[PDB]
Design a protein around this ligand. Structure first.
Ligand SMILES: CCCCCCCC/C=C\CCCCCCCC(=O)OC[C@H](COP(=O)(O)OCC[N+](C)(C)C)OC(=O)CCCCCCC/C=C/CCCCCCCC
Ligand SMILES: CCCCCCCC/C=C\CCCCCCCC(=O)OC[C@H](COP(=O)(O)OCC[N+](C)(C)C)OC(=O)CCCCCCC/C=C\CCCCCCCC
Ligand SMILES: CCCCCCCC/C=C\CCCCCCCC(=O)OC[C@H](COP(=O)(O)OCC[N+](C)(C)C)OC(=O)CCCCCCC/C=C\CCCCCCCC
Ligand SMILES: CCCCCCCC/C=C\CCCCCCCC(=O)OC[C@H](COP(=O)(O)OCC[N+](C)(C)C)OC(=O)CCCCCCC/C=C\CCCCCCCC
Ligand SMILES: CCCCCCCCCCCCOCCOCCOCCOCCOCCOCCOCCOCCO
Ligand SMILES: CC(C)CCC[C@@H](C)[C@H]1CC[C@H]2[C@@H]3CC=C4C[C@@H](O)CC[C@]4(C)[C@H]3CC[C@]12C
Ligand SMILES: CC(=O)N[C@@H]1[C@@H](O)[C@H](O)[C@@H](CO)O[C@H]1O
Ligand SMILES: CC(=O)N[C@@H]1[C@@H](O)[C@H](O)[C@@H](CO)O[C@H]1O
Ligand SMILES: *[C@@H]1O[C@H](CO)[C@@H](O)[C@H](O)[C@H]1NC(C)=O
Ligand SMILES: *[C@@H]1O[C@H](CO)[C@@H](O)[C@H](O)[C@H]1NC(C)=O
Ligand SMILES: *[C@@H]1O[C@H](CO)[C@@H](O)[C@H](O)[C@H]1NC(C)=O
Ligand SMILES: *[C@@H]1O[C@H](CO)[C@@H](O)[C@H](O)[C@H]1NC(C)=O
Ligand SMILES: [K+]
Ligand SMILES: [K+]
Ligand SMILES: [K+]
Ligand SMILES: [K+]
Ligand SMILES: [K+]
Ligand SMILES: [K+]
Ligand SMILES: [Mg+2]
Lengths: 262, 987
């Protein structure tokens, strides 16, 4: 008898598992009730999503941040960059975009009923060719070979978030530290003016827009000096987008180290 | 065997034993060799362990060591992940530091429990003379006492302290104070005569440090240093193994339960961790987190705060503790061994009885005159009171009229001092009365006359006669009387009166009291004119055929509050044993008066006398009481001492040596008793050290007794023992409520890590937040259970069985951990998922989500809705998880502390709000909570988020469930005492 008799060893066990079943049962029911208060289309609260994050492809990380470095002379130092850039643009082929439709409105695309197939809302196409020179055609190297590389700037999507309708939200890239000897960062954006069209908003969530695709803007850096370390900051200029958070450097902004070796 | 035998040797043998001279002393040289052979004649001070090294082992021990290991890992992690430039994990620095602070702050809590830390031998060296007069080479001179050696020839005079243990060869009217040996300051005669077997009672040994009260003597130094009787008493005081108090035992018990369970939980999951694919360094960190979760970092601290609030309460009743452990022990005590003189008694000789008018009257002997008085309407009494008043030479010192007559300081012997205070208390003013009857002649008490006498003018102007008044030993006073005062008349002393006298006299003697006879005689003017010349050496006056007035007897009486205090303890299941250096007859009388011996109890010698049958045949079992003296005790085996302790529940040990007290204490301890000792004298310090708690009288106490004791009664009020028993029983019952409350929340601190590891959902509860709960939000409410009143009538309960009734036993733990702690854990997870799902993360998506969640290269993770999230945003939502789990536990700790108010009573019977400090603690809990949540800045400093009102409500159905569940459990056990429900689900 290992601390009590073996008949009492059993009636204790039964109680504890019964207790544990009831409690488990009670908990399971709480989660079920919870999943009925929950709307499958719109989150109850978006406390941590007041402003959208920003990200950039190709995303290569060094220590404590985004760090990108290649050699124009050795095409194999940028092979992977172009490759993940190409591989990323795959979901933006015209074929991958068959689920979403043309948007010409250049205004917010409000859908309150589900007219798209299988009881969904429509989403707007965005095809790789909208990035033009930085689409992989006719330059499959995305501007890396010529030392004027394209970086793709994507905005995190948030259900029902409206960025501001006085104009389209734009991207702007400049040097973090503008070199005293240097000129400003000279950049050409695709589409023109680095804008995301208004139609792509609001996002209605993965269940309402399963084929939704984030619009993109490519930043073709024309200025950047060879064999030097620089830092580029790309900010989203929109009425409802902020980029001042010191505890989230990816809020409304994205920064990266760059060095183009020769 | 260093026992003195030199009292039984002749001078021839003593000179040969010590190579000395009984008149010329040792040679100068040999005393210098002997000095180098034996060392100084001084008490060797054993230094206890250094103050700093006692603080060190306060940093070891079960929980302290786990904390050490945990901070070790946090430092290493903070090392490995800064040797590769990762700055985010400075938490693992702060984590290590905070833990190290907890280790150190806890270590202080165990060290500042010891208030005094004064040496015991400091007081013993203080009882030792600095100088002596020695004779060496027939030159008498004064030497340092530490230069004395066995063989030295020493001179003692009255007023100086005796410079070693000494075999007396010559003495002129020499008397000593042996209170440090016997506890009694009655002066003992020293002669060169061998008057006893034991060197402790023979007249021709005098002891180092004892005061020579009067006379002169010479003698041979027979022991020095630690070999003296006082050195051996001091050795026994300091060199006692420092055993753990009953509560220290109990605390280390539950620490060893927890440190084991922590190690189980940590190590089995470290294996699970590695088994499920984590790296070694990551499992090593889980082990640290699990230990931080499961171990109760603030528990030891709450315990010493609870003791402190008992110490404070005790202190307010003039009962002072020297270490907070001692604040419990009387609660667990089952045997009290008590000194008599100055402990149970006042150490003040007092008028106790009177024989007059052929009846024995009882005087009120209490120090506050709160007792029952005697009949004073008699005219025989008025006469006897005039005799004992005029025939006294003592006097009160000037201007003490604001002092109570018992406390006042009298110039005289103990006897006369007793009669004078008795006078002042029955009359208005004894010294003034005395002045109204001027003394015209006197014989002070003398060894030849064997009595004291004086003759007096009378106050009344009209009456010119002189009154002779005389006191002395009763038989010797009686043999000089021819008449006696009985009921208003004066009667010739026939054989029936002389026999009546002898009976009263031996009766008062049988009460352990000292007796004096008192007689008078009115001298006629016709033979003695108003100016008659009363010459002492002429003896013109008669001195025979006087009128006997009465007997007066005296005793060292109980303190007033002591007889009821002793009944209280017995009523509480505590055995009470008298252990005294005094003589047995007196000891038995006081034992009976105080209730150590109940009315009706008989010794085997008592029964033997009633049946007029010899003692050999009395059935030992049939005697409830027993009186054993020091000699009998020295004769017994230990199998015999335990057989006597078991046989007679009312036990008196008289005429015991200090070692004999300690031997009796430890005899009870070996039997399973938690033993307290109450005393006051140097002779009690060894027993005081050896007791599980030693209590000393603050006023009557000697320094050795106070410094050996663990508790001091500043007002000398023995009834404070009764308080101590109660508060001790309260603290223990309340500590287990507090501890139960503190432990139960360790489980929902733990289970989030178990799910985090084995399910890889995002981390529900961080280490920093845990510390805030363990060290801050929950600390006041656990402490407020100190103020919980008794559920039952505790002072009528038996003392607890220290083997079966522990502070924390398996029922308390399992219930707290694996039933209530589990309810809390379920609450927590319920809020966690509610807060996650309401923020975009459905439960099924959290499973396996940890890696992408905690990935700094992933700034666009998609939630259940497809929304994209940065690490930052995810991190804050992780904090929102911490915070929602934190309030799930706090809310449940409200229910918890309410169900810990009572272990058996319902909350509806004794009410929810009687304990007022608890509610203040509950309110302060919620405030510091709201502060942590809603003070701006908190998210970036302590990872606390201002949660939505809904996530405070989510766990309240669980708390209400905790109250209802325990409320019914406690109902079940009141309604079913013998049932399974009690035997298993009562804690
Ligand atoms: C000592 C022994 C202890 C034993 C402890 C046992 C703990 C486990 C207990 C129960 C297991 C989980 C119960 C889950 C119940 C689910 C009920 C349910 O039907 O809900 C539905 C969800 C799916 O939602 P949906 O796709 O329909 O939503 C779509 C939204 N709409 C509906 C609006 C369209 O089903 C689901 O989530 C399924 C996934 C459930 C999530 C897994 C959570 C894992 C966390 C466990 C922590 C437990 C801590 C226990 C502490 C014990 C202390 C000792
Ligand atoms: C022995 C008797 C004691 C126990 C009985 C008490 C339990 C039932 C009694 C009262 C329950 C409510 C008490 C008040 C506290 C509310 C807690 C709560 O509201 O909790 C609900 C959560 C999900 O919250 P929500 O999304 O509805 O919030 C909506 C927020 N708004 C409406 C503002 C948008 O789910 C859940 O706890 C699960 C709720 C399902 C009911 C099972 C309760 C399980 C308790 C055990
Ligand atoms: C005396 C002590 C007794 C010890 C008890 C041992 C009994 C249980 C032991 C094994 C049970 C089954 C083990 C399954 C076989 C190995 C599975 C495995 O090799 O998976 C390793 C995974 C990592 O692989 P990944 O694909 O996630 O890598 C992602 C790579 N990246 C991060 C770059 C994206 O580890 C992770 O980090 C996250 C885990 C994800 C994989 C699911 C496995 C969870 C299933 C069961 C665990 C429950 C055990 C609890 C036992 C409780 C006892 C009280
Ligand atoms: C002192 C007293 C304390 C007692 C507490 C002790 C706790 C010890 C308990 C251990 C039980 C561990 C259960 C382990 C479950 C592993 C589930 C699993 O590894 O299953 C795989 C799927 C999850 O989805 P996934 O792998 O595609 O996501 C991965 C997405 N990727 C591939 C892109 C990265 O699970 C599914 O479908 C549905 C499976 C639902 C799992 C619910 C588990 C709740 C159970 C217990 C709580
Ligand atoms: C038998 C006993 C068992 C039962 C036990 C019951 C326990 C009862 C305990 C009662 C506790 C009461 O708790 C009060 C909690 O107050 C929460 C306040 O909620 C505020 C909701 O607001 C949501 C916060 O949203 C974040 C953004 O806030 C925007 C507005 O901010 C205005 C300025 O405030 C700054 C901080 O929010
Ligand atoms: C719920 C399921 C998954 C777990 C069941 C495991 C069993 C074996 C565990 C869970 C709770 C455990 C009990 C918890 C409480 C007690 C009471 C204590 O005085 C002795 C140990 C004992 C009796 C434990 C024995 C083992 C135990 C019964
Ligand atoms: C104006 C415009 O956007 N035209 C093209 C067209 O080639 C195609 O028909 C349409 C989908 O119907 O996709 C796009
Ligand atoms: C800041 C800036 O240069 N904005 C230009 C704007 O001047 C021009 O009218 C427009 C043409 O579509 O392209 C954009
Ligand atoms: C739902 O509709 C979509 C339309 O894009 C179709 O591709 C898919 O096969 C349908 N699935 C079901 C289960 O009806
Ligand atoms: C984009 O492509 C067109 C066509 O070759 C060319 O004229 C233009 O200069 C290109 N822009 C850049 C920045 O290369
Ligand atoms: C912008 O949006 C608001 C919606 O509140 C709409 O009423 C307004 O007409 C819009 N204005 C422009 C210039 O797009
Ligand atoms: C780039 O590559 C060429 C040859 O492939 C090499 O000579 C040169 O040093 C490289 N650039 C740097 C900065 O190393
Ligand atoms: K803890
Ligand atoms: K005196
Ligand atoms: K007179
Ligand atoms: K004393
Ligand atoms: K002691
Ligand atoms: K002891
Ligand atoms: Mg005494």
């Amino acid at each position: 008898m290992l601390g009590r008799t073996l008949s009492r060893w059993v009636w204790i066990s039964l109680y504890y598992v019964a207790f544990y079943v009831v409690m488990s049962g009670i908990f399971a029911l709480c989660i079920y009730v919870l999943m009925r208060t929950i709307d499958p289309y719109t989150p109850d609260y978006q406390d941590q999503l007041k402003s959208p994050g920003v990200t950039l492809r190709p995303d290569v990380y060094g220590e404590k941040g985004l760090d990108i470095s290649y050699n124009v002379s050795d095409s194999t130092t940028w092979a992977g960059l172009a490759h993940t850039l190409h591989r990323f643009l795959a979901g933006y082929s015209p074929a991958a975009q068959e689920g979403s439709i043309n948007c010409t409105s250049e205004k917010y695309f409000f859908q309150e009923s589900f007219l798209a197939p299988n009881h969904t809302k429509f989403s707007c196409k965005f095809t790789a060719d909208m990035l033009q020179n930085c689409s992989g055609r006719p330059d499959p190297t995305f501007g890396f070979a010529e030392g004027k590389p394209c970086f793709i700037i994507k905005m995190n999507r948030i259900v029902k978030f409206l960025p501001g309708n006085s104009t389209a939200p734009r991207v702007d890239c400049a040097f973090l530290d503008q070199p005293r000897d240097g000129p400003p960062l000279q950049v050409e954006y695709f589409p023109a003016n680095g804008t995301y069209s208004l139609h792509y908003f609001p996002y209605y969530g993965k269940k309402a827009q399963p084929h939704y695709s984030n619009p993109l803007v490519a930043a073709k850096l024309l200025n950047v000096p060879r064999n030097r370390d620089v830092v580029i900051v790309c900010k989203i200029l929109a009425e409802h987008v902020s980029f001042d958070n010191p505890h989230d450097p990816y809020e409304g902004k994205v920064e990266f180290k760059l060095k183009i070796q020769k | 065997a260093m026992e003195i035998n030199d009292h039984q040797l002749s001078v021839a043998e003593l000179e040969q034993k010590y190579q000395t001279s009984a008149t010329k002393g040792l040679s100068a040289s040999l005393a210098a060799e002997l000095l180098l052979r034996d060392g100084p004649n001084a008490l060797r001070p054993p230094r206890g362990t250094p103050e700093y090294v006692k603080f060190a082992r306060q940093l070891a021990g079960g929980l302290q060591c786990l904390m050490w290991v945990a901070a070790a890992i946090c430092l290493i992690a903070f090392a490995i992940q800064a040797s590769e430039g990762d700055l985010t994990t400075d938490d693992n620095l702060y984590l290590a530091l905070a833990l190290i602070a907890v280790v150190v702050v806890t270590g202080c809590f165990g060290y500042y429990q010891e208030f005094k830390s004064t040496n015991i031998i400091a007081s013993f060296k203080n009882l030792v003379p600095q100088q002596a007069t020695v004779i060496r080479d027939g030159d008498k001179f004064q030497i340092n006492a530490d230069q004395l050696v066995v063989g030295d020839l020493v001179e003692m005079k009255g007023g100086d302290r005796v410079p070693a243990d000494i075999r007396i060869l010559q003495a002129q009217g020499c008397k000593v104070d042996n209170s440090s040996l016997t506890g009694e300051s009655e002066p003992q005669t020293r002669s060169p005569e061998c008057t006893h077997e034991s060197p402790l009672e023979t007249r021709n040994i005098a002891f180092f440090s004892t005061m020579c009260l009067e006379g002169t003597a010479q003698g041979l130094v027979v022991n020095t240093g630690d070999r003296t009787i006082i050195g051996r008493i001091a050795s026994l005081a300091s060199g006692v193994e420092n055993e753990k108090t009953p509560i220290a035992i109990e605390i280390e018990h539950f620490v060893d339960i927890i440190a084991g369970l922590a190690i189980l939980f940590g190590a089995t999951f470290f294996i699970v961790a590695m088994c499920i694919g984590y790296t070694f360094l990551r499992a090593m960190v889980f082990f640290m987190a699990i230990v931080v979760a499961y171990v109760p970092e603030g528990l030891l601290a709450t315990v010493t705060v609870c003791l402190s609030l008992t110490a404070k309460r005790l202190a307010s009743k003039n009962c002072v503790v020297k270490n907070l452990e001692a604040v419990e022990t009387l609660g667990s005590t089952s045997v009290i061994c008590s000194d008599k003189t100055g402990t149970l008694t006042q150490n003040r000789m007092t008028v106790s009885h009177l024989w007059f008018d052929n009846h024995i009257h009882s005087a009120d002997t209490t120090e506050d005159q709160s007792g029952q008085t005697f009949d004073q309407s008699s005219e025989t009494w008025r006469a006897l009171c005039r005799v004992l008043t005029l025939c006294n030479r003592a006097a009160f010192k000037s201007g003490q009229d604001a002092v109570p007559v018992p406390k006042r300081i009298v110039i005289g012997d103990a006897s006369e001092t007793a009669l004078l205070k008795f006078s002042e208390l029955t009359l208005g003013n004894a010294m003034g009365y005395r002045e109204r009857f001027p003394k015209v002649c006197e014989i002070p008490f003398n060894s030849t006359n064997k009595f004291q006498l004086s003759i007096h003018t009378l106050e009344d102007p009209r009456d010119p006669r002189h009154v002779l008044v005389m006191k002395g030993a009763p038989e010797r006073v009686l043999e000089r009387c021819s008449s006696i005062l009985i009921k208003g008349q004066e009667l010739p002393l026939d054989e029936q009166w002389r026999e009546a006298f002898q009976t009263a006299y031996l009766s008062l003697g049988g009460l352990g009291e000292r007796v004096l006879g008192f007689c008078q005689l009115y001298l006629s003017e016709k033979d003695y004119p108003p100016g008659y010349a009363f010459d002492v050496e002429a003896m013109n006056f008669p001195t025979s055929g006087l009128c006997f007035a009465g007997l007066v007897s005296m005793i060292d009486p109980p303190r007033a509050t002591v007889p009821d205090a002793v009944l209280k303890c017995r009523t509480a299941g505590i055995r009470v044993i008298m252990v005294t250096g005094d003589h047995p007859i007196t000891a038995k009388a006081i034992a009976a008066s105080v209730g150590i011996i109940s009315e009706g109890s008989e010794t085997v010698e008592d029964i033997a006398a009633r049946l007029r049958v010899p003692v050999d045949q009395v059935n030992r079992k049939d005697a409830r009481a027993c009186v054993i003296n020091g000699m009998q005790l020295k004769d017994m085996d230990p199998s015999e001492l335990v057989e006597a302790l078991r046989t007679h529940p009312e036990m008196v040990f008289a005429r015991t040596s200090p070692q004999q007290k300690l031997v009796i204490v430890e005899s009870c301890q070996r039997l399973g008793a938690i033993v307290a000792v109450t005393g006051d004298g140097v002779n009690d310090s060894p027993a005081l050290k050896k007791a599980d708690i030693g209590v000393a009288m603050g006023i009557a106490g000697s320094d050795a007794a106070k410094n050996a004791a663990d508790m001091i009664l500043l007002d000398d009020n023995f009834a404070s023992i009764v308080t101590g028993v109660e508060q001790g029983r309260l603290i223990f019952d309340n500590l287990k409520k507090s501890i139960a409350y503190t432990l139960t929340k360790n489980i929902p601190e733990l289970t989030p890590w178990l799910i985090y590891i084995t399910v890889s959902v995002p981390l529900p509860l961080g280490c920093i937040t845990i510390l805030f709960i363990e060290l801050c939000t929950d600390i006041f409410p656990s402490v407020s259970l100190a103020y919980e009143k008794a559920e039952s009538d505790i002072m009528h309960l038996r003392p607890r069985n220290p083997k079966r009734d522990r502070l924390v036993n398996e029922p308390l733990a399992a219930y707290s951990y694996f039933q209530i702690g589990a309810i809390q854990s379920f609450a927590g997870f319920t809020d966690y998922f509610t807060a996650m799902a309401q923020e975009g993360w459905f439960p099924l998506l959290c499973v396996g989500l940890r890696p992408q969640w905690e990935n700094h290269h992933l700034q666009d993770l998609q939630d259940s809705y497809g929304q994209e999230w940065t690490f930052g945003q995810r991190l804050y939502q992780q904090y929102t998880c911490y915070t929602v789990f934190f309030i799930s536990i706090e809310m449940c700790q409200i229910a918890d502390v309410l169900i810990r108010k009572t272990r058996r009573l319902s909350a509806f019977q004794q009410g929810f709000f009687r304990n007022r400090i608890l509610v203040i603690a509950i309110v302060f809990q919620v405030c510091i909570g709201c502060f942590l949540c809603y003070c701006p800045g908190m998210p970036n400093i302590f990872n606390f988020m201002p949660i939505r009102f809904q996530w405070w409500l989510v766990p309240m159905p669980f708390s209400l469930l905790i109250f209802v569940y325990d409320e019914i459990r406690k109902l079940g056990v009141r309604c079913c005492p013998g049932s399974w429900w009690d035997q298993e689900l009562y804690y």
